[PDB]
Amino acid sequence: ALVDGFLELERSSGKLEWSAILQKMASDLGFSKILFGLLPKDSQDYENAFIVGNYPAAWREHYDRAGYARVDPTVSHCTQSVLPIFWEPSIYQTRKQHEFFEEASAAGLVYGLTMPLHGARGELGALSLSVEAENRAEANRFMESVLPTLWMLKDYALQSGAGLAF
Amino acid sequence: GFLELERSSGKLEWSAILQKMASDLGFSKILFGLLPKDSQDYENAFIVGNYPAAWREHYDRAGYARVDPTVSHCTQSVLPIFWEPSIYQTRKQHEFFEEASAAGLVYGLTMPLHGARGELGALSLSVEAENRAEANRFMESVLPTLWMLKDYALQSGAGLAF
Numbered sequence A: 001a002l003v004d005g006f007l008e009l010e011r012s013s014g015k016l017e018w019s020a021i022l023q024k025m026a027s028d029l030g031f032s033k034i035l036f037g038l039l040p041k042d043s044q045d046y047e048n049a050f051i052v053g054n055y056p057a058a059w060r061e062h063y064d065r066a067g068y069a070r071v072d073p074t075v076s077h078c079t080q081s082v083l084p085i086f087w088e089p090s091i092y093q094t095r096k097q098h099e100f101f102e103e104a105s106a107a108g109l110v111y112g113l114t115m116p117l118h119g120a121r122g123e124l125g126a127l128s129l130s131v132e133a134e135n136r137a138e139a140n141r142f143m144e145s146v147l148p149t150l151w152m153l154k155d156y157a158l159q160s161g162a163g164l165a166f
Numbered sequence B: 001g002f003l004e005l006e007r008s009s010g011k012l013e014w015s016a017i018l019q020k021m022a023s024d025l026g027f028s029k030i031l032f033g034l035l036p037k038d039s040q041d042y043e044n045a046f047i048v049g050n051y052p053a054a055w056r057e058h059y060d061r062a063g064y065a066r067v068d069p070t071v072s073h074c075t076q077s078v079l080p081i082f083w084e085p086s087i088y089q090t091r092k093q094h095e096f097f098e099e100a101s102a103a104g105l106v107y108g109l110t111m112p113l114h115g116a117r118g119e120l121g122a123l124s125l126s127v128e129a130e131n132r133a134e135a136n137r138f139m140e141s142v143l144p145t146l147w148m149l150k151d152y153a154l155q156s157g158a159g160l161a162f
């Protein structure tokens, strides 16, 4: 129930409740782990982004410490496009990106996609969602099956989330 | 049909592809409008589509971008705005609703466009129906597809425009 979810987000109070609702929307849809990240207009301060979700804490910590925002191919994608980027080995091209892939894989981030977020007031962000699957073909099958719902979800989360972050 | 949008060469072909996509989906007339980062020069926007020419000319001449409630909505939101009578609130907006309605833009919605490089825009789509309830039923039925379509149109259109 997408619209119901949105209304729940917009009747929530504080970051904890908002994050619980969003995570449950994603979980119900069939995704595993999620990260919603948002920066205000003109900011490139990734290490101080508004971050929501259930990525493993030690991974989030590692990412900040290693300055992976500068290497993560989804981040660079988000600066150039409003279209999703699917997590495939082909997006990891540089030597650093291969290292990144290995570390993200260890944290359970193998299959999934990232939806770039570009808000009405210049907010810049991402909604990333991982998928538990036995192979790429099955992960892609699931993602296709829910892509239209998720496409609406990312914009509802952006509109609501932007008000909470800022 | 985003690959068709990208395969295309020039505005004429792009416009024809987008219009067909909207028609095939069940919409009547469409407008894709786009401005570059920081611009509020609505009278010089990049505009694509099949809105009646006389209507587009009127909108520019009356400076309706100052009163159009979908324009204000786009500055504040990434979410659709359906063309409900309730959105036209001020005296000038009532007049706008009357004139737009005469142009065949009675039922429909506008999807705000916010590009990765700060582009600001709208994809507006009108629906022919016997009443608003019937139009609203149709729009809800194709909304997921449209929601994808607007982002594909934006990514491609931004390249074409700028």
Ligand SMILES: Cc1ccccc1C(=O)Oc1c(Br)cc(Br)cc1CNC(=O)c1ccccc1Cl
Pocket: A035, A036, A037, A038, A039, A046, A047, A049, A050, A051, A055, A059, A060, A063, A069, A072, A074, A075, A078, A087, A104, A109, A114, A124, A125, A126, A128
């Ligand atoms: C805040 C922001 C703005 C614009 C674009 C991205 C972000 C953002 O939150 O980036 C981040 C930040 Br900070 C921290 C972390 Br942990 C993760 C991301 C986004 N990257 C991914 O979700 C991802 C995708 C594929 C494989 C591995 C990973 Cl880790």
Ligand SMILES: Cc1ccccc1C(=O)Oc1c(Br)cc(Br)cc1CNC(=O)c1ccccc1Cl
Pocket: B031, B032, B033, B034, B035, B042, B043, B045, B046, B047, B051, B055, B056, B059, B065, B068, B070, B071, B074, B083, B100, B105, B110, B120, B121, B122, B124
């Ligand atoms: C360029 C732009 C940026 C941001 C938001 C909108 C635009 C844009 O193209 O606005 C315009 C411009 Br210029 C010209 C015209 Br003719 C129409 C619009 C958008 N408005 C509508 O489509 C509409 C909606 C409901 C009822 C009647 C109408 Cl006419």
